[PDB]
Design a protein around this ligand. Structure first.
Ligand SMILES: [K+]
Ligand SMILES: [K+]
Ligand SMILES: [K+]
Ligand SMILES: [Mg+2]
Ligand SMILES: [Mg+2]
Ligand SMILES: [Mg+2]
Ligand SMILES: [Mg+2]
Ligand SMILES: [Mg+2]
Ligand SMILES: [Mg+2]
Ligand SMILES: [Mg+2]
Ligand SMILES: [Mg+2]
Ligand SMILES: [Mg+2]
Ligand SMILES: [Mg+2]
Ligand SMILES: [Mg+2]
Ligand SMILES: [Mg+2]
Ligand SMILES: [Mg+2]
Ligand SMILES: [Mg+2]
Ligand SMILES: [Mg+2]
Ligand SMILES: [Mg+2]
Ligand SMILES: [Mg+2]
Ligand SMILES: [Mg+2]
Ligand SMILES: [Mg+2]
Ligand SMILES: [Mg+2]
Ligand SMILES: [Mg+2]
Ligand SMILES: [Mg+2]
Ligand SMILES: [Mg+2]
Ligand SMILES: [Mg+2]
Ligand SMILES: [Mg+2]
Ligand SMILES: [Mg+2]
Ligand SMILES: [Mg+2]
Ligand SMILES: [Mg+2]
Ligand SMILES: [Mg+2]
Ligand SMILES: [Mg+2]
Ligand SMILES: [Mg+2]
Ligand SMILES: [Mg+2]
Ligand SMILES: [Mg+2]
Ligand SMILES: [Mg+2]
Ligand SMILES: [Mg+2]
Ligand SMILES: [Mg+2]
Ligand SMILES: [Mg+2]
Ligand SMILES: [Mg+2]
Ligand SMILES: [Mg+2]
Ligand SMILES: [Mg+2]
Ligand SMILES: [Mg+2]
Lengths: 63, 129, 386
RNA sequence: GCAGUCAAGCGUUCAUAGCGACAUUGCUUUUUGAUUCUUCGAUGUCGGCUCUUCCUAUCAUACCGAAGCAGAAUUCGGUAAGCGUUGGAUUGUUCACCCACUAAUAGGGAACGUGAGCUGGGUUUAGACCGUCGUGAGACAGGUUAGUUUUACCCUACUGAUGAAUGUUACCGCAAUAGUAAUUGAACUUAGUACGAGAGGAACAGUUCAUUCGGAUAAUUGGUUUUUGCGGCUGUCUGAUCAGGCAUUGCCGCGAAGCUACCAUCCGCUGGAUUAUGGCUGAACGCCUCUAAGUCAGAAUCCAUGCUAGAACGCGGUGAUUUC
RNA sequence: CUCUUAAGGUAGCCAAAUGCCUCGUCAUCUAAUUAGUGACGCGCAUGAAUGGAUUAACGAGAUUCCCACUGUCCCUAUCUA
RNA sequence: GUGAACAGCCUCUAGUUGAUAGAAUAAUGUAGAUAAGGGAAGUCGGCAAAAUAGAUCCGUAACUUCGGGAUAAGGAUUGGC
RNA sequence: UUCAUCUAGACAGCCGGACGGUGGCCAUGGAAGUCGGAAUCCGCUAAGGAGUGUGUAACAACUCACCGGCCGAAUGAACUA
């Protein structure tokens, strides 16, 4: 099996977990759960959402 | 020739026309192969052939019943690999009773189940899921 | 006049009455037909429903669109510590059915099974089987006489086994005792097997094996008093309905001038005995085997217990049976897993399943990590520790 | 309304494949009449919705016989009611009609089932308008609009739920009786084969799915949120802060658990006896004959296997049975 | 050309809240319309202050279609008092 | 106080804390809510509910008795500092 | 009940023959026993219809009425209830 990545939060997605969203431009978005899916639908910025790997990278958290 | 897909387009649903035939939407009036149950609306899923009319589009396509094939669903369904997925919208393409497309191109993605079910949809398709 | 539109009736008339099962342990009402050429073996096993998880495996089904592809499936985990054999029952056949001639018990019975014979164990003098254990005083002559009666009679032989709840995380502390038919030949050696196994444990791997179709017999989750709309699935009456809409509108014609048994009525839902067949064993896991949740593809040295424990159950420490799909009953409930009554050869049976991965993320939430090691590796150092 | 009998004819020939005149015998009571026996100290009067069951004069599905049955399709008929028999536009409508799917969209009963189950569009009080009629008040199976749908806590029935008594108490069982369930399609392949000049074009075996139904289940996905769990926001109040109250759950995002969805997943058994029918042997009747004696196969049928309940006045095995 | 009246329904309007036949006919609206609308009119039985025709605005009046919207429904589920 | 406001919501003075209670949290209710995808397919009928909503700026059709229609329709903005 | 056949050999059964004038007359596009109308003859005859059916376009070719070979005692038809 292959572990996917949450398009919003960077979380690791295991088989069957979360949802997959195909945008009209054929882009694929994987969400590990309804929280990340709902923030994406609300058009929040992961770089602004403080628990996402994208925010942690932009803010040099962990490193 | 296809596993069950959560029905998301009951009779009366209007999806976008994804082909270049001159139709802008398809209005579901029936679903091929659908069963019977009192009060239950016939409902389509990705890859189903429906009977539909063109509500808006070129006048030559309107005011008549024609087969269509659902290429995008937007109602979440579960693939056997455990993936719950959905598109941004519901979309279909006009076809004849034998499954051949009336148009010559699809705009936007096409569900993999539909592409496997209908080779003409697959041949005219761009991105597939 | 006629119905004016045909629909199938709501509910199954063969599962009536929708009453509470008389016991929390569902009775095995039929054992597999005896083939007296095979060795002596139990026809069923007792376990406790721990909970569900999900697995990943490669489907082997030629002609399927998912042949040699990956499929995610739901599985149920049944905690199955070995059952202790404590007795044997002989059944003679009669023009009035089967009839127990006599039961021979083991000499020493654990407190687990002894509790089953007591409503108030804590204040009893625990006299159960104290005079019976004296039947083994010097030679066990009476015990051997009863076993000889069973051999001379008793066309059907069943052992009495009890669970070891002390090995489960359950608080119940009172074992479940059940009769399991012994299949295999020579009723004499059925009796010999039972006598030799007195006071001894039998593990689930000696009863069940990988890929085997089994049946699950359990009392379903109870839901109390239920109205027709959910108890039977009848159509909700329109919003305009005076006096409520979660009802059946016409509960009968004028004649017969009686409500008929087939009309949906409100009553108890759930807590019914159910025997559901053809659940494939996906794993026969052992408690002592660390890497219980591991496969030949995952190799993560982890057990079957999800992170944080099986919700409302605890941790799997014993032998366990992983069946495909779902089985009747809720978590912590005693379940009887029995061998199939027929030889299924349908290519859905007979398929050799190899698990590729077993989910162990927490079921207490949207579990993100399979192991605490993976959680630490993803999250880095936190303030508390790690 | 449905079904027979006869058989002049139709069916290119040919009465009876399928039909069938002139006649004639019936059945049914889902038509409408006829009657006025019951009800006028009152049986709630259309239709629909909902739900159960029953009938068979069978639309489909099973197995078959016949054909003007080459195949395919169809038609006639037998056992058959086990199983299903739909979504819509217009109309109060029943009925009708069309669109459409479907294996098929069969007909009916149950106080023209079903109003203390609903609804109240219609009819069928009182308001009002029109047309025709009437001098008029007013009439109108003419049209139109508005118009209170009451009560169960009793008995039974039904659904579930306790329970005295059998020395007590406990555990494990048996199984009388009662119920019972699965359903239908598609695709691949057989096979572009059999068959057919051709056009076309099967089936059995095998495989993957699906429809309708049913029983569970909550790993996942989704829904639900008083977890008032975390955060945010408005207004006001606690001098400010922190932290809070109130806004009838203040509002918003996320939200675990639980519950739950063909909106999720899993599961839904195999033996015998038969019906129609086709056969064996074989007389009656030197032949013939599935039938008479005997006998073989055989249906979605039946009875079992299996599944649910367990007789609270059916039964068995087993443990312990009170020093005072 | 007849019979005939007090006068023989004029201007208008209509299957209209007035048309039996009738779900009239044509067109439009829909996949499908006994609905709606526009036309037609030998109109059972339309029609001129018993007011005719029309009308901006107004209407808890009757009606049809469309967009939005939704648990009305598919098909139900859940929560609170 | 907010606010256009005698609106709603919170507060001061004053007044009251009165409605039979206790325990549970089944069905069916009454009242209040939410709901994937579809969006009136429900129904006689969109009944009920939802959606809209304040203010500022832009923009506003047929028709009209010239007065209206009109908040037509249709858009954009709004906090804090 | 009635009428028939029958040791001068019945019924059934199996087997043999089932001819010639003659493609009888008429027609028909063709019609030979057999799509039809009409005539129902004669010889050989133990016996054979100008034909009981199948068959051909017509032929042909099979088949039956009819008579024989075998068997040997009963049998057939139409009615009545
Ligand atoms: K009366
Ligand atoms: K949840
Ligand atoms: K506050
Ligand atoms: Mg969730
Ligand atoms: Mg309906
Ligand atoms: Mg019916
Ligand atoms: Mg259910
Ligand atoms: Mg009401
Ligand atoms: Mg969980
Ligand atoms: Mg009364
Ligand atoms: Mg009454
Ligand atoms: Mg019949
Ligand atoms: Mg009635
Ligand atoms: Mg009633
Ligand atoms: Mg009533
Ligand atoms: Mg009624
Ligand atoms: Mg009314
Ligand atoms: Mg009135
Ligand atoms: Mg008058
Ligand atoms: Mg009247
Ligand atoms: Mg909330
Ligand atoms: Mg206060
Ligand atoms: Mg608060
Ligand atoms: Mg024979
Ligand atoms: Mg017989
Ligand atoms: Mg009993
Ligand atoms: Mg005029
Ligand atoms: Mg008129
Ligand atoms: Mg009109
Ligand atoms: Mg309409
Ligand atoms: Mg005048
Ligand atoms: Mg008038
Ligand atoms: Mg007014
Ligand atoms: Mg101010
Ligand atoms: Mg919704
Ligand atoms: Mg939505
Ligand atoms: Mg919409
Ligand atoms: Mg409608
Ligand atoms: Mg309807
Ligand atoms: Mg209507
Ligand atoms: Mg309203
Ligand atoms: Mg505006
Ligand atoms: Mg306007
Ligand atoms: Mg001829």
């Amino acid at each position: 099996m292959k572990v996917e990545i949450d398009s919003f939060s960077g979380a690791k997605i295991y088989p069957g977990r979360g949802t997959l969203f195909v945008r009209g431009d054929s882009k694929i978005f994987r969400f590990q759960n309804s929280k990340s899916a709902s923030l994406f639908k609300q058009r929040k910025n992961p770089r602004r959402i403080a628990w996402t790997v994208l925010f942690r990278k932009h803010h040099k958290k962990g490193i | 020739t296809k596993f069950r897909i959560s029905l998301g387009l009951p009779v009366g649903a209007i999806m976008n026309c994804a082909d270049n035939s001159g139709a802008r939407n398809l209005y579901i009036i029936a679903v091929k192969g659908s069963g019977s149950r009192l009060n239950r609306l016939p409902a389509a899923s990705l890859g189903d052939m429906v009977m539909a009319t063109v509500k808006k589009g070129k006048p030559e396509l309107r005011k008549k019943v024609m087969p269509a094939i659902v290429v995008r669903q937007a109602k979440s369904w579960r693939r056997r690999d455990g993936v719950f997925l959905y598109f941004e919208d519901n979309a279909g393409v006009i076809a004849n009773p034998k499954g051949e497309m009336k148009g010559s191109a699809i705009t936007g993605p096409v569900g993999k189940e539909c592409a496997d079910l209908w080779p003409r949809v697959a041949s005219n398709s761009g991105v597939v899921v | 006049s006629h119905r004016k539109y045909e629909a199938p009736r709501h509910g199954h008339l063969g599962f009536l009455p929708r009453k509470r099962a008389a016991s929390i342990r569902a009775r095995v009402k039929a054992f597999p037909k005896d083939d007296r050429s095979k060795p002596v073996a139990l026809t069923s096993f007792l376990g406790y429903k721990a909970g569900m998880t999900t697995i990943v495996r490669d489907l082997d089904r030629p002609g399927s669109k998912f042949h040699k592809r990956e499929v995610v499936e739901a599985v149920t985990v049944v905690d199955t510590p070995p059952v202790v054999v404590v007795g044997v029952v002989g059944y003679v056949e009669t023009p009035r059915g089967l009839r127990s001639l006599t039961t021979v018990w083991a000499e020493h019975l654990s407190d687990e099974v002894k509790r089953r014979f007591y409503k108030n164990w804590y204040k009893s003098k625990k006299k159960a089987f104290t005079k019976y254990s004296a039947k083994y005083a010097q030679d066990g002559a009476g015990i051997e006489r009863e076993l000889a009666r069973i051999k001379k009679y008793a066309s059907v032989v069943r052992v009495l086994v009890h669970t070891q709840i002390r090995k489960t995380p359950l608080a119940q502390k009172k074992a479940h005792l059940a009769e399991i038919q012994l299949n295999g030949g020579s009723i004499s050696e059925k009796v010999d097997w039972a006598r030799e196994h007195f006071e001894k444990t039998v593990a689930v791997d000696s009863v069940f094996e990988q890929n085997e179709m089994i049946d699950a017999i359990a009392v379903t989750k109870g839901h109390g008093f239920e109205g027709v709309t959910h108890r039977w699935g009848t159509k909700k009456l329109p919003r305009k309905t005076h006096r409520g809409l979660r009802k059946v509108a016409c509960i009968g014609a004028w004649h017969p001038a009686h409500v008929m048994w087939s009309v949906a009525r409100a009553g108890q839902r759930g807590y019914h005995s159910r025997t559901s067949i053809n659940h494939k064993i996906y794993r026969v896991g052992k408690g002592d085997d660390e890497a219980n949740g591991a496969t030949s593809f995952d190799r993560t040295k982890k057990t079957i217990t999800p992170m944080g424990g099986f919700v409302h159950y605890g941790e799997i420490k014993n032998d366990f049976i992983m069946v495909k799909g779902c089985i009747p009953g809720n978590r912590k409930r005693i379940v009887t897993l029995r061998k199939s009554l027929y030889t299924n050869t349908s290519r859905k049976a007979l398929e050799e399943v190899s698990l590729k991965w077993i989910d162990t993320a927490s079921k207490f939430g949207k579990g993100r990590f399979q192991t605490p090691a993976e959680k630490h590796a993803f999250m880095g150092t936190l303030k508390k520790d790690l």
